[PDB]
Amino acid sequence: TRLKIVTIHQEPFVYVKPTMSDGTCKEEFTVNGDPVKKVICTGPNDTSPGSPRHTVPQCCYGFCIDLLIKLARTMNFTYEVHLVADGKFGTQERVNNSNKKEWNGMMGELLSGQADMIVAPLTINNERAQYIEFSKPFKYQGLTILVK
Amino acid sequence: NGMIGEVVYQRAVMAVGSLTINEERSEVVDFSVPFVETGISVMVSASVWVMMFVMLLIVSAIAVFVFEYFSFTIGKAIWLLWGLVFNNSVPVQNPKGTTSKIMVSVWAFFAVIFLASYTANLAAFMIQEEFVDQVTGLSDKKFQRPHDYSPPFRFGTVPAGSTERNIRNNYPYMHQYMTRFNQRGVEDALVSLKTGKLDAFIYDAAVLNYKAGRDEGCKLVTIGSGYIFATTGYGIALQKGSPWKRQIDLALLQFVGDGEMEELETLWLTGICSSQLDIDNMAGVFYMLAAAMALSLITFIW
Amino acid sequence: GRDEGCKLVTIGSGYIFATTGYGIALQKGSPWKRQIDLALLQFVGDGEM
Amino acid sequence: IIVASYTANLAAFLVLDRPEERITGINDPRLRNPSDKFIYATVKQSSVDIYFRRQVELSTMYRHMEKHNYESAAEAIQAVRDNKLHAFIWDSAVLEFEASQKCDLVTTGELFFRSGFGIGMRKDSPWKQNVSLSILKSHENGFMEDLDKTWVRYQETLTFENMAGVFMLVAGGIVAGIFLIFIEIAYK
Amino acid sequence: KSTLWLLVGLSVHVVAVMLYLLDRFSPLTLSSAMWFSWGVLLNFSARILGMVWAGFAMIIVASYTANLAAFLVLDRPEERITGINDPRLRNPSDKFIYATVKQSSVDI
Numbered sequence: 001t002r003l004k005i006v007t008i009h010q011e012p013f014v015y016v017k018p019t020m021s022d023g024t025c026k027e028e029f030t031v032n033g034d035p036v037k038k039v040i041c042t043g044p045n046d047t048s049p050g051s052p053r054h055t056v057p058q059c060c061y062g063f064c065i066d067l068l069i070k071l072a073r074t075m076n077f078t079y080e081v082h083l084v085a086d087g088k089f090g091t092q093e094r095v096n097n098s099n100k101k102e103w104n105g106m107m108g109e110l111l112s113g114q115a116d117m118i119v120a121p122l123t124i125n126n127e128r129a130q131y132i133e134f135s136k137p138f139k140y141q142g143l144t145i146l147v148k
Numbered sequence: 149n150g151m152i153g154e155v156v157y158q159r160a161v162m163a164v165g166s167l168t169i170n171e172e173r174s175e176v177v178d179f180s181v182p183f184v185e186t187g188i189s190v191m192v193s194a195s196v197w198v199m200m201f202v203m204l205l206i207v208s209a210i211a212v213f214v215f216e217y218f219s220f221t222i223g224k225a226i227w228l229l230w231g232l233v234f235n236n237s238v239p240v241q242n243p244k245g246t247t248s249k250i251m252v253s254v255w256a257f258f259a260v261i262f263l264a265s266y267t268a269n270l271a272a273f274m275i276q277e278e279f280v281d282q283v284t285g286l287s288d289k290k291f292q293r294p295h296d297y298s299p300p301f302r303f304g305t306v307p308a309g310s311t312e313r314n315i316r317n318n319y320p321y322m323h324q325y326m327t328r329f330n331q332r333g334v335e336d337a338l339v340s341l342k343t344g345k346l347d348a349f350i351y352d353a354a355v356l357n358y359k360a361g362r363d364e365g366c367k368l369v370t371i372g373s374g375y376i377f378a379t380t381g382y383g384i385a386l387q388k389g390s391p392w393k394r395q396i397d398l399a400l401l402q403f404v405g406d407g408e409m410e411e412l413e414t415l416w417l418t419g420i421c422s423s424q425l426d427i428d429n430m431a432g433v434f435y436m437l438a439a440a441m442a443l444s445l446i447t448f449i450w
Numbered sequence: 451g452r453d454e455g456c457k458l459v460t461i462g463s464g465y466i467f468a469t470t471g472y473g474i475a476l477q478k479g480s481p482w483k484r485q486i487d488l489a490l491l492q493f494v495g496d497g498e499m
Numbered sequence: 500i501i502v503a504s505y506t507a508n509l510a511a512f513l514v515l516d517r518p519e520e521r522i523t524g525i526n527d528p529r530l531r532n533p534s535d536k537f538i539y540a541t542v543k544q545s546s547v548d549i550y551f552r553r554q555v556e557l558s559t560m561y562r563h564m565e566k567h568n569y570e571s572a573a574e575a576i577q578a579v580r581d582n583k584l585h586a587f588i589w590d591s592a593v594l595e596f597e598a599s600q601k602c603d604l605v606t607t608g609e610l611f612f613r614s615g616f617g618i619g620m621r622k623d624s625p626w627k628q629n630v631s632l633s634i635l636k637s638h639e640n641g642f643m644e645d646l647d648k649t650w651v652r653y654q655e656t657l658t659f660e661n662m663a664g665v666f667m668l669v670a671g672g673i674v675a676g677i678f679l680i681f682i683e684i685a686y687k
Numbered sequence: 688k689s690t691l692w693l694l695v696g697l698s699v700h701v702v703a704v705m706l707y708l709l710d711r712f713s714p715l716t717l718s719s720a721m722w723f724s725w726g727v728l729l730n731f732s733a734r735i736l737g738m739v740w741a742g743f744a745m746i747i748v749a750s751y752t753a754n755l756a757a758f759l760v761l762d763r764p765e766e767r768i769t770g771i772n773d774p775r776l777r778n779p780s781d782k783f784i785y786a787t788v789k790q791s792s793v794d795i
């Protein structure tokens with residue numbers, strides 16, 4: 001009943017904010033009469049050459065955090081949200097020797113046993129579904145271009 | 149009844165025929181991964197005037213200064229100034245001063261490119277292609293009460309479908325306004341809209357977008373893409389515990405991730421669809437002259 | 451059909467020229483010609499070309 | 500005839516040679532065989548990378564994007580924002596959010612690879628059935644619509660193009676026109 | 688391979704009477720004001736009504752120039768077929784009567 005959740009800082013979905021003084025979130029309201037249900041999340045600062053080890057308690061909120069709060073409200077379980085140790089979703093890359101494939105990113109921390117449920121903007125394709133099971137989608141999109 | 153009674157009761161293997169997916173269907177079977185985005189929908193049918201006035205004040209002050217230099221251009225320079233913006237061929241005043249003539253040669257030459265820029269604005273108005281819409285979605289004030297507007301309009305769906313069960317599990321009092329006003333066929337909704345007997349028609353959005361590709365004259369346009377709506381996906385039903393699901397899901401995601409679904413979306417989905425109408429501008433045209441004749445009652449008594 | 455700028459345009463379709471085609475060269479006497487030509491006309495006829 | 504031709508071709512000055520680029524999607528042949536000026540990329544080691552690696556007719560753009568792929572979305576937003584990049588292929592939801600946030604960023608036409616957002620699980624985890632039913636439980640009522648109200652649905656001619664210097668000349672030459680009259684003072 | 692002109696003709700004759708009415712109100716006029724009202728739209732409060740009608744004069748011919756420039760330029764109609772992808776050929780009617788030579792190459 002304590003399922004480990006991993007995610008990544010997505011700009012419309014998972015807002016990551018530094019805490020105010022020491023592990024405290026600025027509990028702001030919405031524009032409708034509801035406080036933003038932030039959650040205490042852990043994760044690194046930045047890239048490995050830039051940040052070798054900088055993990056502070058942080059405030060994660062947004063869309064998928066509210067989805068996880070809805071799931072923990074419906075199904076009877078607690079959780080402990082951390083983040084991934086890089087900035088990658090996860091691909092199928094050969095390691096240096098032994099002729100062996102590897103999955104990094106969120107599937108990397110999943111298949112290593114460090115996570116149990118990935119709540120993230122997870123794009124459904126054939127390659128990930130061969131190795132992990134998916135649920136039914138909750139938001140449908142495509143692909144497009146951003147211009148100026 | 150129908151397909152699900154053949155699937156659940158051990159008489160059919162899978163439902164390759166197209167089927168919506170909601171929650172209580174999924175409790176007894178195992179649906180595959182969806183492949184097409186199927187919601188539900190409803191098939192229905194500033195500074196120029198200020199700074200030109202400031203320049204008008206400047207040019208009128210200089211026109212007064214012409215007579216201050218050296219002849220009835222005392223206060224009636226406005227009646228020539230804004231009149232020669234339009235080149236109305238009206239006898240107003242013959243400028244006897246060289247300064248006034250050079251100032252008119254500046255002003256009217258600016259007015260020529262100003263009216264040419266107004267023709268460019270009208271060409272951009274020709275570029276501006278509009279398509280007016282009425283209803284935002286399912287939670288409109290039209291739908292919640294027919295007496296909210298003076299005609300109580302009529303909306304209908306297809307019987308015994310998933311849309312009716314979504315209504316009966318989401319909006320019970322909405323259902324009784326449609327229960328008297330049902331309809332049966334797919335093309336019966338087209339008949340009811342082209343005859344105007346029925347106002348609205350709530351149905352799945354993708355099939356209505358297909359029917360929009362063959363509308364006679366393309367006069368029926370839906371509302372958005374299901375923004376305030378169900379937003380599910382069509383998927384192949386199976387039985388519970390069937391090992392075919394792991395193969396079918398990977399085969400569908402193989403079909404999507406290489407453009408093989410894209411050719412089928414191109415083929416079996418028809419992706420199709422000089423007068424005067426300026427009543428928003430004609431209202432201002434009549435009302436500015438209404439204000440101009442309303443100022444006449446002020447100018448009468450004084 | 452892929453040049454940027456499009457500053458180089460030909461003259462119509464080459465109207466005063468040879469107007470030939472690209473084929474498959476075979477040796478004089480090989481039996482593959484009759485089998486290849488029917489398959490090429492089949493490739494034209496089904497719109498796959 | 501001169502003012503008619505001038506009024507015609509000043510309107511035609513902004514009709515013929517417009518910036519009507521309008522790439523709108525994947526089917527631009529300038530991006531099929533790309534130059535080193537139309538710069539476009541995505542996140543390195545993402546789902547877009549595998550989606551363009553599988554398709555054998557989209558590998559060439561891959562051989563462009565292997566020189567340009569980035570790590571975070573916001574750095575790519577800032578790079579295309581100051582025109583260091585020139586295009587950005589990405590997921591439609593994030594782009595339609597951030598174009599609404601900042602109006603300098605613009606989304607465009609095509610919506611290809613229609614897929615959905617999943618939740619990573621194990622093979623036979625006991626939290627598979629009721630969670631997959633609870634997502635559609637959120638679909639059937641308006642709670643997904645309420646979450647769209649929180650974030651997704653939640654929002655946030657000028658006739659001065661070629662006559663600005665003419666406006667400056669009108670605002671400036673009045674002093675010279677009165678100086679002509681000061682010369683006419685010396686004429687008298 | 689005009690409609691709203693009657694409203695303009697009614698409005699100009701409303702103006703051609705109310706100019707003389709304001710000339711009576713404000714402290715041959717019938718030959719002056721009528722010829723003025725015919726002359727403005729075709730190229731002190733009475734002068735105010737004259738300059739307002741003169742301001743609304745040129746917008747009429749400007750919009751007429753606009754919709755003639757939009758009327759004989761844009762709508763070159765789809766009297767052609769647009770090839771094989773014609774919706775009147777995928778599911779045809781008597782609108783586009785299309786066929787070929789009987790027993791020919793197109794039939795094969």
Ligand SMILES: *[C@@H]1O[C@H](CO)[C@@H](O)[C@H](O)[C@H]1NC(C)=O
Nearest residue numbers: 045046047049050051052054
């Ligand atoms: C986080 O980022 C930088 C770069 O990785 C790192 O040097 C430092 O530890 C942190 N600084 C900030 C801005 O908090």
Ligand SMILES: *[C@@H]1O[C@H](CO)[C@@H](O)[C@H](O)[C@H]1NC(C)=O
Nearest residue numbers: 001002073074075076077078
């Ligand atoms: C939920 O979880 C708590 C803590 O494990 C347990 O004691 C309780 O029986 C459960 N109650 C409900 C509402 O299912």
Ligand SMILES: *[C@@H]1O[C@H](CO)[C@@H](O)[C@H](O)[C@H]1NC(C)=O
Nearest residue numbers: 093094095096097098100102
């Ligand atoms: C192999 O190992 C080196 C040292 O860690 C590293 O720089 C290199 O990227 C590795 N190559 C891969 C990813 O197989």
Ligand SMILES: *[C@@H]1O[C@H](CO)[C@@H](O)[C@H](O)[C@H]1NC(C)=O
Nearest residue numbers: 075624625626627628629630
């Ligand atoms: C799912 O919900 C049902 C409700 O009765 C329960 O019996 C079952 O154990 C649940 N399974 C899990 C662990 O999700």
